[PDB]
Structure 1
């Protein structure tokens, strides 16, 4: 009864082998649950097919004579006001537009043959509101602009799912910055001022570390009584941990060494190594105890899950 035909948009059309009552060829295709229907004086599968959704919008598919392009148009109930238009080519590239009630372009999206894309939204003056470019890999950069045409936010997401996200003030300087790492943990900088100064906050699994950004670097502090543990992030991004005890007694005072090659803070009490604090590549902290002498580590490292557990390690 029919013959099936492959079309640009991962879609297919069926075409009758016989002519109908009116000398024409029947055409049928389903497109998102909607069955579109039409007829053509041709039988290669080209032509227009139309439908109506349940909410009364009209759908029209036009398939070019050579079958190398398709246009899908959604209209409102009047059949005249365009809502969306998607044009697709057999190389898989594409164009989508969406329109508002007035019929201005509100959204536009170009898709390349390599699935990379550029998306743009326009405000009600028809000016650029937001733009996103997504790269062949999975990388993506993404901008927002205010009602004065100025950048207000920018976000550089990467292949590994890492991202930097900036917000901008009136001078067009960075007043907030959020840094996410592949592992989902964050670095959050707020209230950034022209000198450098701002709040800092590292968000980890189960707890947050707080501190300050200066133009020198980032310092996150944990305090327990006389002890202060400081986690420094330098302008290169390298981590350094530091311990200060405002204690003066010997039998009790804590003291620590940082080994940058291992990313491990070892704490000594009374000339004997007591435990190791490891700060991992998965940006977790772990603790492990030494033996009597302080020569070797024993048991198994234990992941810190709450802040109150870092404090108890510093007692």
Structure 2
């Protein structure tokens, strides 16, 4: 008829009649999630109660506060009293969304705040938290999923700098797999972890992947080329160290190397002459640079490694 359309918290609209009826009251109509709700308010601004009935006989109730700052959207069973669901939303767009089990307790609670952070909670038939997913205003987040025993089954923690840790547990609740994603996208992938702390390790860099092992004290990624084995060692605090071993006994060709932790540089020597510098940068890259044919000092420029063969080549 002659209605005014009013925008409501929670992305809903209501139509309220412009003209009061015989009793000073106003007709209200709203469509929410395809259901047409209707009511009658003694207010003329779109506040009041609207109600509807779904095809499965659920009753729906929309309550709009007097100043239009809040809406409450309730779904009941057919008695119109047993609460199935409830969504409360404020003008600042903070909102709580609740689902309720057949006991009338919460099975799900989802809260969004004004700063856009949010928490999702799921609860099993025991009333215990089975899943939690929080996101914060800086887009960091925590994900926890619990098995029927109530132990962790999966956990992912993401930071503001986009680094993250993903953890997966076996049916016994013990840590099986762990992925550490650095701020720059490079990854440490731990798999086949056993209860004694060891397992298989991969570092996924930009362009190539290193393989190795995890033990009690460090991760060791190994690159072997013929007689020469280069071992990249990351301690528990992420402090990188590098070893090189050459089983070539011939003095004309054998590779020695000296690791300088201050410079993050492995300097390779052949036949009493320096030959190349390998720099393990703080940005999870490797560069190689060659010394001159006299071993005096470096020549040309450093080249950032983009492929595993380039590491192998530097070891020939």
TM-score normalised by length of structure 2 = 0.80
Where structure 1 has 5 or more consecutive residues not aligned to the other structure, the ranges are none
TM-fit CA distance, 1:87: 0.7
Q: Secondary structure at the match of 1:310?
A: helix
Please give the per-residue CA displacement for 1:11-51, whole angstroms capped at 9, x wherever unaligned. Answer: 56554433369965355667789987765332122124578
Alpha-carbon spacing, 1:46–1:266, altered in 2? closer, same or farther (3 Å): same
> How many pairs align?
315
Over 3 Å counting, the alpha-carbon distance change for 1:258 and 1:60 in structure 2 is farther
Worse-matched range after superposition: 92-101 or 266-275: 92-101
1:203 CA drift (Å)? 1.6
Q: Distance in 1 between matches of 2:308 and 2:55?
A: 55
Where 1:18 maps in the other structure, the secondary structure is coil
1 CA distance for matches of 2:191 and 2:210?
A: 14
Separation (CA, whole Å) in 1 of partners of 2:108 and 2:81: 19
Q: 1:314 to 1:75 in 2, by over 3 A?
A: farther
TM-superposed CA distance for 1:81, in Å, is 9.6
After superposition, the Cα gap between the structure-2 partners of 1:286 and 1:22, relative to the gap in structure 1 and judged at 3 Å, is farther
- The 3 A distance-change label for structure 1 pair 241 and 52 is farther
Which residue of structure 2 lines up, in the alignment, with residue 30 of structure 1?
Answer: 31
Q: SS state of the match for residue 251, structure 2?
A: coil
How much has 1:181 moved relative to structure 2? 0.8
For 2:238 and 2:67, the matched residues in 1 are separated by 56
Task: Report deviation, 1:127.
Answer: 4.5
Specify whether residues 246 and 56 from structure 1 end up closer, same or farther in structure 2 by C-alpha distance, changes over 3 A only: farther
1:90, distance to aligned residue in structure 2 (A): 3.4
TM-superposed CA distance for 1:253, in Å, is: 1.4
Per-residue CA shift, 1:267-303, capped at 9, x if unaligned? 2222332222222333122223333333443444333
Residues 171-209 of structure 1: per-residue CA shift (max 9 Å, x gap):
754333221111122112223233322222212223221
- Work out the CA distance in 1 between the residues paired with 2:101 and 2:306: 49
Q: CA RMSD in A?
A: 3.7
Q: For 2:10 and 2:53, how far apart are their aligned partners in 1?
A: 20
Alpha carbons of structure 1 residues 12 and 297: separation in structure 2 relative to 1, 3 Å: farther
Superposed CA deviations along residues 213-246 of structure 1, whole A, max 9, x for unmatched, are 1112111111010000100011221011111111
Shift of 1:146: 0.9
Length-normalised TM-score, structure 1: 0.80
Segment drifting more, 214-223 vs 60-69: 60-69
